[PDB]
Nucleic acid binder design. Sequence first.
DNA 1: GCTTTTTTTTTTCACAATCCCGGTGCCGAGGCCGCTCAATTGGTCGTAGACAGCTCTAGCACCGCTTAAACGCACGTACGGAATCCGTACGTGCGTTTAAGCGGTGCTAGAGCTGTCTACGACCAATTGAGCGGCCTCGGCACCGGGATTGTGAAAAAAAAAAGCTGCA
DNA 2: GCTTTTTTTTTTCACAATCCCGGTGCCGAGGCCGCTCAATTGGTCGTAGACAGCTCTAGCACCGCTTAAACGCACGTACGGATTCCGTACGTGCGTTTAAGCGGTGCTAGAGCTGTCTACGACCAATTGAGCGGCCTCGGCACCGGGATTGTGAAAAAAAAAAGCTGCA
Lengths: 57, 57, 80, 84, 99, 99
Amino acid sequence: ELAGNAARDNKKTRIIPRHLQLAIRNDEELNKLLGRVTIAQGGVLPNIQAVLLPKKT
Amino acid sequence: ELAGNAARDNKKTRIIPRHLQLAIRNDEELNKLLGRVTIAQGGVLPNIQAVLLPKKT
Amino acid sequence: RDNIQGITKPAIRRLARRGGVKRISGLIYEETRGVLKVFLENVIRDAVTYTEHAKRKTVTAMDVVYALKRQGRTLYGFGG
Amino acid sequence: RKVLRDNIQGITKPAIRRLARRGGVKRISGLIYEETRGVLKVFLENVIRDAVTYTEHAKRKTVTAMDVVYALKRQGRTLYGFGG
Amino acid sequence: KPHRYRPGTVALREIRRYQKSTELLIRKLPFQRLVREIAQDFKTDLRFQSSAVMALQEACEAYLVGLFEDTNLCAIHAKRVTIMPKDIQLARRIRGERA
Amino acid sequence: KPHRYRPGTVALREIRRYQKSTELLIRKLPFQRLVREIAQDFKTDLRFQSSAVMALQEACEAYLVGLFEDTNLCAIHAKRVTIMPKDIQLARRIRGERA
DNA sequence: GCTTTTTTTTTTCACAATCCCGGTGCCGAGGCCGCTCAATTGGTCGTAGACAGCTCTAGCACCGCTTAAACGCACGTACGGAATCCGTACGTGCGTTTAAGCGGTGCTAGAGCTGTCTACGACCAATTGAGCGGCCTCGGCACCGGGATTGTGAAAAAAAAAAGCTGCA
DNA sequence: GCTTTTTTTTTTCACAATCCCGGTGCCGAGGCCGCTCAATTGGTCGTAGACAGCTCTAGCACCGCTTAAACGCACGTACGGATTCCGTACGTGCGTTTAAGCGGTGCTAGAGCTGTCTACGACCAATTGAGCGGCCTCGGCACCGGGATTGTGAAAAAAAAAAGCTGCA
Ligand SMILES: [Ca+2]
Ligand SMILES: [Ca+2]
Ligand SMILES: [Ca+2]
Ligand SMILES: [Ca+2]
Ligand SMILES: [Ca+2]
Ligand SMILES: [Ca+2]
Ligand SMILES: [Ca+2]
Ligand SMILES: [Ca+2]
Ligand SMILES: [Ca+2]
Ligand SMILES: [Ca+2]
Ligand SMILES: [Ca+2]
Ligand SMILES: [Ca+2]
Ligand SMILES: [K+]
């Protein structure tokens, strides 16, 4: 369901590893279950620590 | 062999958990094997990070 | 029932001594308390789950030991 | 056939910089790059040794993707998308 | 004769003292009560073997001493001698006890 | 005059790029050679199924990428923006990787 | 309160990268199909484990001691964290250099499958002794204590160095 | 080079902690004993897998081009880290309070054991359909070019500070 949604989100008809990774990593529980799991060709969630951005206004 | 030494250094004829915990933690290889193990009534190896000790006089 | 406060400042200090810690902010004693709580929840849940599966009303050492092992925190000297 | 070169250097500064980009790192000490290589090296040693053992046990002369996978799962670094 | 050790000096003595010993550092009953209190939330009218409470304490304390060790390093990594909440959160974030 | 982005502003661009993508960030052959180089040290004259070299890469890049994550958190813990070998060693110490 | 300088915040574009569409082409998802081997049916036979009955263990509750440990306040020292400062390490952008990646081709170690036979391990029934639970003794070890020793500070007292004067060739 | 004053060095007095003597007391290591239950001996029976032999997957090598990527250097910004500085959140140590710890007594849930009986799962042989491999096609998606949007940053105008006068008094 989730992967699928993150595929629809990408305007892509076929689920790919990225979609799986996004589904899993973005979902508190799935993530725990797959805590020590490495999805091949999955990448990582967009995440830039706050203090590394410049001063916003 | 190692714990029994540890006892004999303490002036004891009984091996006890501390002797076991000492034997193991001061032995690079054993320590590694029992890295994710807790020895009940073992305690820890005396260790005070240097920065915390006072400028020596 | 608020037994978490039974985990006194002194006892907490002691533990951290043994961890080679020298100076301790005041906010840590509560932070410690939470952590300690979360740990126990995770261990006890599992332990009791073993208890309920053997259809008992009395939690055993083994229950604990079997839980701790699931949790990666294997324990020697209570019937491993 | 042939004994191999000194390749660890092929894990270039660019590549190491790219990987640390993926990890959200903005600024990078000069000393990082060589330290990484050492870490990377030790990682590959550890996995490959285990894989090769699974190879050697199966009396095969060709390391399989599954050898890697079994080793990686042994090392606590479970990998999806290559079997098992 | 007003004799006082300067701040940090008994702390060190303590560190030496307790690393050397094995006895449990949390008082036992309070611990026991806490276990029982937490137990209730999963299944009522439980009992415990005394030895199962001791296995739990041995484990918790060991957990904590260890977590402190890592916390202390994280303090020192920020050029501090005093451990702070944030140090513990980093220790656990890196360990993977939380996000 | 000529354009020139301030120090950091491309680095952030790079971050966004690479977190958005899934492609392997080490060059495939050098990795291959390195694997074989390390392979030898255990057993001579060995073959690798591509899928096995690739599974090693996926696994490597992943490990390294996480280490940078833990590392950046150690830098930021010491009120820095710049990761250092002392940051890595802490991640790895706390992780349990080395003593 | 004045007044100038920095300094901060806001305004005006110019550029460069990123994003988004339609177009084009390629290849792998998707599904059909035919055959195989692994699920299903419908048998029997044995024992795992549910169940009731009982023993007695160890978990629970309560009491009252005697401390050792918690607590809560008084007082100050050393530590955290803000502010200030300087030097250069590391990001950016450019042109030069290098080799990864592309695909193609040819050569073959070795992955992987089959068929043949037998050494070896499960699986009987029978013999039996090593290791189990229970129980008894006595020395190791905890405990005290005291008084000597030493390792570990902290204060106060002496040396050296810092800051301010100075006068002098 | 002298004075003064601030920092650092040195000694000189203290105090928990340690250790070596002695001495004492208690309980659990460590050994004994009387079973029994689990390892051993022996032989039977069925198939797991070493081994030989064939297939043919796919792994390795080799080359020469295109160009994306790596390399090296010029240059200066904003970073890391040193230094300096103040407020107070911490650790030390009083005294008073609290409740844990022990030793012991009393009750019973419930843990754990025994034996009994049968519903349920292993095992088989025959039956057969689902899920395998092979195969084919066609639409999603990767790739590109081109145009619209987005966000960075430089330089030039308004607000908006210190930051240093001017009295004022
Ligand atoms: Ca039975
Ligand atoms: Ca400081
Ligand atoms: Ca015995
Ligand atoms: Ca007897
Ligand atoms: Ca004895
Ligand atoms: Ca004696
Ligand atoms: Ca004494
Ligand atoms: Ca066979
Ligand atoms: Ca029952
Ligand atoms: Ca069909
Ligand atoms: Ca198919
Ligand atoms: Ca189709
Ligand atoms: K009981």
